[PDB]
Amino acid sequence: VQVNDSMYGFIGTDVVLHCSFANPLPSVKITQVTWQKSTNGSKQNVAIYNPSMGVSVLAPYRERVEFLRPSFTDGTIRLSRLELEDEGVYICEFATFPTGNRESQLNLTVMAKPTNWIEGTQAVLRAKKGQDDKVLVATCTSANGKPPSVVSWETRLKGEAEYQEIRNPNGTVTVISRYRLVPSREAHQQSLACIVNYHMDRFKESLTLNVQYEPEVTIEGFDGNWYLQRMDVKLTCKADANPPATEYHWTTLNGSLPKGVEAQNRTLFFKGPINYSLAGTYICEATNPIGTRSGQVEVNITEA
Amino acid sequence: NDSMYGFIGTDVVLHCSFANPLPSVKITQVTWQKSTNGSKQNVAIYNPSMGVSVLAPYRERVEFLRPSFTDGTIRLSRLELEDEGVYICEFATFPTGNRESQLNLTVMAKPTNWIEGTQAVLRAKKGQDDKVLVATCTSANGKPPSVVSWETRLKGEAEYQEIRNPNGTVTVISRYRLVPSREAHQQSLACIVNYHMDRFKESLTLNVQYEPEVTIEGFDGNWYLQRMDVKLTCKADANPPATEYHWTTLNGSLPKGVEAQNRTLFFKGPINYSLAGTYICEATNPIGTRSGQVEVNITEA
């Protein structure tokens, strides 16, 4: 807010801090050029150039700071292998005689690319008719970023995202987003993508939900013409269920399974000539670990 | 963390020295700058190899006491308000870099004090519930502000006003108001201003005009049958003084023969069992008229 000059560089990288003495006169003799850092209400010395005694660099900076082209007018330095603790205000001061000192300051901000990942829930997801609880389904994390990234979601699911930002000791910020929804049949196998944006980079990872649900039964095998005397036709029970259906049981809307119709393993075979007596509604009851549910087909018997 | 205070016009010494001069460490230059605030301007420089340099506008006001590898102490002369600020003294050294010390300079000003009463003619009057201005105490161009207060047995309201002037000083003005009364007359009113343990004091004496308050004296417990030659005297407390005195009784008439010469009421010679009664003097003044009474007893005793 007091400084008009700001530098930014990523952890690990080098930045060039500039300082020049604008308007040299024959009168002004430049006595010494001093870089200092302040975190604020410390000033501490960084590097010095004296035209007559040479260059000094103080620790911690002994291997990381060096003047580019030391001169009566130039005290530009390079700071290498940038570290988070390098953040601060850097002051460059030209000591001159008899004209006094001149200084210029700048801000150094150190940036860090975050580490991003999506991880799904470790629970099993059940669609139950009872619970209307919003359950955790995926977590997207952007850790150790600086400045903080922006997290968001891309999905067709109707759910709720919570956000949490944590300032770490080192000044980086971890962003966490939790996606919660109420598990339903329509949610199964739906894609859920986590998007993370940092200084215009774009991370994206996807999950596919796995939601358990009780069976949704349909019966296939009845075409238009189950005409009289026709033989060897059958119905198959299609149980849409997660996990898959374990047991099957056939029955009719007019009592138990008749003679001339026997059930094995989810297909109902009608052995022998067809007759009017077999017309009716046939039912299949499929069972999985979640529950039992049923489906039917109206079977009318033709004459062709 | 280090603060200096000096008065306008005086000289102050701003100390700077280098604690632990060390074999390695070569002092390159010594520099004073004044920061007013967020700005650093150069004040004086001492370079061992090149000498001393004082910069405008200080050439005639600043000098190093004893320039040296380790002492940069200066004297700032003829202090002015505009000298307030933070002074930084920096030792440039090699190869250890710069070492600096700061101090705050606060410039002080002793205020100028005085009191003045109203030009108005303070006049007591029944029914006037209104407080009127009677003295103004001023402590002008002080810094920091002084503290103004009154010392009187009057029971009035003092208001205070504090004005921050462009130059940074502060004028303090106190106005003392009261409802004018007979008792307030001739009472002293003293403003007192305390500045840095100095105590200034200046007094006024109120002049309040009032309608007369009448008293009648000359009366004696025992008054004979036939005592001689006996007087009553009407002392009227008034300001300005009463100019007219008129006598009467509570039953209208002045019993012959009682002669009135003003503000004395002589009875010749014989007294009797008449000469009963209430006696009244009516005093008048530019305010005023008002009266007093006496119950007069006479027996053989």
The CB-side HSE value for B142 (13 A sphere, CA atoms) comes to 22
How many angstroms separate the CA atoms of A49 and A30, rounded? 10
Residues B118 and B166 in one domain: yes
CB contact under 8 A, B53 and A99: yes
What does the H/E/C string look like for A28-56?
A: CEEEEEEEEEECCCCCEEEEEEECCCEEE
How many angstroms separate the CA atoms of A138 and A124, rounded? 12
Q: Between A48, A97, A103, which is nearest B97 by CB?
A: A48
Buried b (16+ CB within 10 A) or exposed e, A70-104: bbbebbbbebeebeeebbbbbbbbbbbbbbbbbeb
How many angstroms separate the CA atoms of A39 and B238, rounded? 78
Boundary (domain end) residue, out of A156, A183, A213: A213
Q: How far is A169 from chain B (nearest CA, A)?
A: 30
Q: What is the CATH number of the domain that holds B74?
A: 2.60.40.10
Report the domain count for chain B: 3
Q: How far is A120 from chain B (nearest CA, A)?
A: 54
- Residue A189 in 3-state DSSP? coil
How many angstroms separate the CA atoms of A46 and B260, rounded? 108
Give contacts of A33 with chain B, Cβ < 8 Å. Answer: none
Residues B104 and B120 in one domain: no
**Domain that includes residue B146, residue range:** 110-210
Token duo for residue A39? 């975190």
| Residue closest to B204 by CA, chosen among B223, B225, B178, B231 | B178
| Residue closest to A301 by CA, chosen among A221, A227, A233, A222 | A227
Other beta carbons within 10 Å of A178: 16
Buried b (16+ CB within 10 A) or exposed e, B268-284: eeebeeebeeebbbbbb
DSSP string over A253-283: TTBSPPTT-EEETTEEEE-S---GGG-EEEE
Residues A297, A252 contacting (CB under 8 angstroms): no
| Cis omega (within 30 of 0) for bond into B212 | no
Boundary (domain end) residue, out of B109, B133, B161: B109
How many angstroms separate the CA atoms of B13 and B199, rounded? 28
| Residue closest to A136 by CA, chosen among A148, A118, A149, A154 | A118
Residues A172 and A248 in one domain: no
Residues A181 and A274 in one domain: no
Q: Nearest-5° angle of CA A244, CA A245, CA A248?
A: 160
Beta-carbon contacts below 8 Å between A and B: 69
Residues A209 and A219 in one domain: no
Residues B29 and B74 in one domain: yes
Longest Cα–Cα distance of chain B, Å, equals: 122
Four-point Cα dihedral A215, A217, A221, A223, nearest 10: -160
DSSP code of B82? G
Give contacts of A67 with chain B, Cβ < 8 Å. Answer: none
Residues B11 and B55 in one domain: yes
Technique behind this structure?
X-ray
Token duo for residue A47? 């590097």
Q: Nearest-5° angle of CA B105, CA B107, CA B113?
A: 160
DSSP code of A227? B
- Residue B83 in 3-state DSSP? helix
How many angstroms separate the CA atoms of B34 and B54, rounded? 13
Residues A23 and A90 in one domain: yes
Q: How far is CA A221 from CA A120, A269, B166, B168, in A?
A: 39, 10, 102, 102
Boundary (domain end) residue, out of A58, A79, A112: A112
Other beta carbons within 10 Å of A114: 22
What is the β-pairing status of strands B208-217 and B258-261?
A: unpaired
Amino acid at B195: Y
Give contacts of B45 with chain A, Cβ < 8 Å. Answer: 97-100
Q: How far is A73 from chain B (nearest CA, A)?
A: 18
Structure-token match 């799904």, residue found: A120
Residues A237 and A279 in one domain: yes
How many angstroms separate the CA atoms of A114 and B116, rounded? 75
- Interface list for chain A against chain B, based on CB atoms closer than 8 Å: 2, 29, 31-32, 34, 36, 43, 45-46, 48, 50, 53, 56, 58, 93, 95, 97-101, 103
